[PDB]
Amino acid sequence: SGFRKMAFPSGKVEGCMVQVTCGTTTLNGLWLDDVVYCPRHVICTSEDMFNPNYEDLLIRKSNHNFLVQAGNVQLRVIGHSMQNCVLKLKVDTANPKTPKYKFVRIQPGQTFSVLACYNGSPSGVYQCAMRPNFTIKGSFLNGSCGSVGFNIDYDCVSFCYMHHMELPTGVHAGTDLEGNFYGPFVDRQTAQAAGTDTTITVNVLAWLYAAVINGDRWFLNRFTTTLNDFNLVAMKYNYEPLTQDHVDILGPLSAQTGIAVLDMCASLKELLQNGMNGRTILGSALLEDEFTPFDVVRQCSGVTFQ
Amino acid sequence: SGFRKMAFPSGKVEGCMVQVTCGTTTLNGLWLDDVVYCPRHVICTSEDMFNPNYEDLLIRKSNHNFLVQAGNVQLRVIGHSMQNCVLKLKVDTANPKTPKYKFVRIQPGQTFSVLACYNGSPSGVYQCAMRPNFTIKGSFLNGSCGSVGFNIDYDCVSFCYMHHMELPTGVHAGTDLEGNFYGPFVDRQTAQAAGTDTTITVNVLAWLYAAVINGDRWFLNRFTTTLNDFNLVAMKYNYEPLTQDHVDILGPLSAQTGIAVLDMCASLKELLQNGMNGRTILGSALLEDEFTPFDVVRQCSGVTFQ
């Protein structure tokens, strides 16, 4: 019982976090086997900011220009290259605490745990969703660049996000671990702004299911509706359209509660049109959209057939 | 910028979690040096829970009745004893990952991180608060007992909670690591239930500061009030009293924002009576009380000594 914004245990990623210095710029890197990955913007000075020439800046740097520290231990850089916006520093020592891992690119609507770090030292861990407009609503201060987001999928650490920057609305933008930005952003100081966001409908429904599992029922009505009619209401309140895939994805939560997906859709329609009757659901006074169906399952159901 | 429910990195605590089986009950234990700490109710069958005499149930048990497992490696139990409601199993092997640690007893209002575990395997990490009525609104499933809560100062893990049971309302009760329960609860199947809970006023205020710091201002007014007047309003709405110790603790944030504490109390008062008239603060439509002033400062680092 209970429901909380729960992140994955951070231990396997903590052991990969390093500090990377280039001139007067320090930020975080991720150390897997004999490679440290970090934002390429660490090689910039204030004079590069206008039109940074990364290709040129990279070749002009020697291995010695990169100070890499894992705790107190200095790692020697023996090579440097660039994949898109991520810098790959080859080092002389392979990380003995390298977990089994993969680099994955997540989709909008999906969540992951962020390990916020500073000077290569983990500060804290929290859950984020990739917003439909490809930002995350994170929590980062100066020196957090290079912090990474991940999921634990079986035994495997699936790394999906590396932090690059804050946009002027206070939201956050970054790349996958191959250095490609989520969204239409670039790793330089230019006029760029988040597109308008939408609410992740399938996640809201999952969160409602979570409420039902934990004994919140007041918003349940006896109504059912159709995909089509639901989607018309969705659009009116800036909610992403719902698809059959979404309906399928909610199946596990339907079975737990005995509430058909389309019935929960009718309950959601009613909360949208008429509000939340001054009540809270799972310690919140608005409709939460940053929990996937899987996040609800992993927290509230597990492997229960019974 | 940004503000999130953020937990400490769980790595140091992950390396201490182990499984403890006695009979058909499996739950979690904490392995520090050559001692495993777990809830003493691991030795009870379902029947014993009604009226259990642990002193007597313990006599029935030999060392061989406890199977302790760190991953797959069996730790031989060579001693078993009992301090209040926690069992201490002396094992043959000292935990090589034992971090620097203290046992501390926290007070209502203070926050900590929970490493939710199952069969000695970490599942997730989230932030909680010791409620004024000595419960926590955690998120636990079957097999979570013996999961622990902690703060991390430097490399020092301060353990403050071990999880023992779910009360009927879905909220959670447990002990410090010396086995004393928080609040008047007991490890027996009885009529017992949580006292009625109140909101943690000083936390709400810290959060409001966090909001100002992150650009949310609409709830500010120009009024000032006094402690006395404020506390009268507090009492009406089941807020905890605000003391002058709380007023000083908020001095840093008052300074940073240039909003006097009693000014902020006046803003809260208005929110308290009248609500948020359809607006949000830090992405929430209610008053959050699970961030301490310290939690706020950690995510909203000042520029004083930057």
Q: CA-to-CA distance for A272 and B59, rounded, in angstroms?
A: 60
Mutation target vs B (from A3, A8, A10; most B CBs, 10 A cutoff): A10
Q: CA-to-CA distance for A102 and A156, rounded, in angstroms?
A: 7
Q: CA-to-CA distance for B173 and B165, rounded, in angstroms?
A: 6
Surface of A (187-216) touching B: CB under 8 A: 214-215
The minimum CA-CA distance between B81 and chain A, rounded to whole Å, is: 30
Method of determination used here: X-ray
Q: Which two tokens stand for residue A285?
A: 């006074």
Contact B137 A302 (CB under 8 A): no
Residues with Cβ < 8 Å from A157, sequence gap 6 or more? A12, A13, A99, A100, A101, A102, A150, A151
Residues with Cβ < 8 Å from A62, sequence gap 6 or more? none
Residues of B in contact with A143 (CB under 8 A): none
Minimal Cβ distance to A10: which of B9, B214, B280? B9
Phi then psi dihedrals of residue A267, to 5 deg? -70, -45
Q: For B241-279, give the secondary structure using H, E and C.
A: CCCHHHHHHCHHHHHHHCCCHHHHHHHHHHHHHHCCCCC
Q: What angle do CA A134, A140, A145 make, to 5 degrees?
A: 80
Amino acid at A132: P
- Taking phi over 0 as left and psi of -120 to 50 as alpha, with beta for the rest, A238 belongs to left
* CA nearest neighbour of A241 among A277, A205, A286, A282: A205
Amino acid at B100: K
Answer whether A123 touches B (CB < 8 Å).
yes
Options 3.30.200.20, 1.20.140.10, 1.10.1840.10, 3.40.50.2300; CATH of A199-301: 1.10.1840.10
Mutation target vs B (from A126, A152, A300; most B CBs, 10 A cutoff): A126
Q: What angle do CA B165, B169, B171 make, to 5 degrees?
A: 45
Is beta strand B156-166 parallel, antiparallel or unpaired with respect to B101-103? parallel
Minimal Cβ distance to B139: which of A3, A172, A280? A3
The minimum CA-CA distance between B50 and chain A, rounded to whole Å, is: 22
Strand partners of residue A118: A121
Strand partners of residue B232: none
Residues of B in contact with A166 (CB under 8 A): 1
* CA nearest neighbour of B13 among B100, B85, B136: B100
Minimal Cβ distance to A1: which of B4, B166, B280? B166
Q: CA-to-CA distance for B152 and B113, rounded, in angstroms?
A: 9
Contact A137 B10 (CB under 8 A): no
Q: Which two tokens stand for residue A66?
A: 């990169």
DSSP, residue by residue, chain B:
------BPP-HHHHTTEEEEEETTEEEEEEEETTEEEEEGGGG--TTTTTS--HHHHHHH--GGGEEEEETTEEEPEEEEEEETTEEEEEESS--TTPPSEEE----TT-EEEEEEEETTEEEEEEEEE--TTS-B-----TT-TT-EEEEEETTEEEEEEEEEEE-TTS-EEEE-TTSPBSSS--SSSSS--PPPP-B-HHHHHHHHHHHHHTT--TT--S----HHHHHHHHHHTTBPPPPHHHHHHTHHHHHHHT--HHHHHHHHHHHHHH--TT--BTTBSS---S--HHHHHHHS--STT-
Answer whether A16 touches B (CB < 8 Å).
no
